[PDB]
Amino acid sequence: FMVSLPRMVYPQPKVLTPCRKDVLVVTPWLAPIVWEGTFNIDILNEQFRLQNTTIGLTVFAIKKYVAFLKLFLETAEKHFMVGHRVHYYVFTDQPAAVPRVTLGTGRQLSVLEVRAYKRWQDVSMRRMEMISFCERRFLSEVDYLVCVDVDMEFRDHVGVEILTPLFGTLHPGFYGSSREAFTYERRPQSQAYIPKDEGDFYYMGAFFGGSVQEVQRLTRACHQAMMVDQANGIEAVWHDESHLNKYLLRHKPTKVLSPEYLWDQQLLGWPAVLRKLRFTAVPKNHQAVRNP
Numbered sequence: 412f413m414v415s416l417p418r419m420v421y422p423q424p425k426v427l428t429p430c431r432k433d434v435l436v437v438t439p440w441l442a443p444i445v446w447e448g449t450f451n452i453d454i455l456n457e458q459f460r461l462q463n464t465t466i467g468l469t470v471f472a473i474k475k476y477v478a479f480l481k482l483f484l485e486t487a488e489k490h491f492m493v494g495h496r497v498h499y500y501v502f503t504d505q506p507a508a509v510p511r512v513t514l515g516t517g518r519q520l521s522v523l524e525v526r527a528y529k530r531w532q533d534v535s536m537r538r539m540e541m542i543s544f545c546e547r548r549f550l551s552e553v554d555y556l557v558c559v560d561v562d563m564e565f566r567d568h569v570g571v572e573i574l575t576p577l578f579g580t581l582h583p584g585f586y587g588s589s590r591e592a593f594t595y596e597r598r599p600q601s602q603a604y605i606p607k608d609e610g611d612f613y614y615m616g617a618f619f620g621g622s623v624q625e626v627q628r629l630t631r632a633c634h635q636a637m638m639v640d641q642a643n644g645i646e647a648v649w650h651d652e653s654h655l656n657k658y659l660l661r662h663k664p665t666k667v668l669s670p671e672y673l674w675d676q677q678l679l680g681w682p683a684v685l686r687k688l689r690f691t692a693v694p695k696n697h698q699a700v701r702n703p
């Protein structure tokens with residue numbers, strides 16, 4: 412049950428004055444695409460606080476990637492769901508390497524020890540299995556689950572505007588691309604296969620989420636698909652991301668996050684269409700960091 416909002420004073424939405432005219436702000440299945448200027452955060456904060464919303468955030472920091480945790484967590488403290496209940500779940504093979512980060516009130520962190528796989532691809536891919544059925548405390552502890560890469564930092568507001576039954580994020584590399592150019596898995600022998608005449612968007616593996624129920628469905632489905640591929644001796648071109656794209660093609664997200672929510676400034680600069688850079692890639696030497 413949802414109680415009444417209080418009296419609030421804010422600017423009236425004007426029907427004949429769009430918030431943004433430069434970008435698509437709703438998908439053809441009527442899911443909002445979240446861009447700066449499309450939402451009044453004061454209204455959303457009220458709505459979500461009235462439900463006493465708890466948000467779980469998963470992050471994997473395996474082998475050398477433990478090094479990214481300090482900046483990830485300390486910037487999350489500044490920018491992620493501030494004012495709301497947050498539970499961080501840090502999955503790692505090195506619990507003792509998790510930095511001691513000071514948290515704001517109503518926020519907690521749990522360290523979950525997992526095995527490290529040799530291949531960086533396997534580490535990235537096994538996140539689906541680990542999130543799903545494996546971790547069962549989510550249904551009891553949180554309302555929504557957000558699942559992100561660790562090799563990142565928050566620079567601006569990431570808040571309740573993202574919350575919805577199911578969301579994916581537009582990959583910063585491809586938001587302007589036509590579907591034939593998307594790096595979907597193209598081999599029919601893979602469960603992740605998507606033909607050149609199908610596809611809405613190219614979502615990045617580094618930021619997805621939803622209600623606990625929908626996230627468990629997504630991760631379960633992706634894990635089972637990866638298992639079928641493995642039994643068939645095929646590995647999708649972009650690993651977990653290929654399966655995530657297949658899933659979101661066949662199960663449309665109820666919100667889509669703009670690339671404000673996943674950006675690499677070194678690689679892609681700061682285009683006019685991005686009014687804020689919210690959650691951004693931390694430079695890494697891929698080869699060095701992925702191998703002993």
Ligand SMILES: O=c1ccn([C@@H]2O[C@H](COP(=O)(O)OP(=O)(O)O[C@H]3O[C@H](CO)[C@H](O)[C@H](O)[C@H]3O)[C@@H](O)[C@H]2O)c(=O)[nH]1
Nearest residue numbers: 471472473474476531534535560561562616617649650652
């Ligand atoms: O040794 C490792 C390798 C990977 N990871 C975890 O796996 C995540 C994804 O790996 P990368 O960050 O190296 O992947 P990229 O950002 O380079 O590339 C993108 O493609 C991947 C598939 O190749 C994933 O889908 C990922 O979400 C997506 O952003 C990392 O953030 C980290 O959380 C580790 O913890 N340790």
Ligand SMILES: [Mn+2]
Nearest residue numbers: 560561562617
């Ligand atoms: Mn990453």
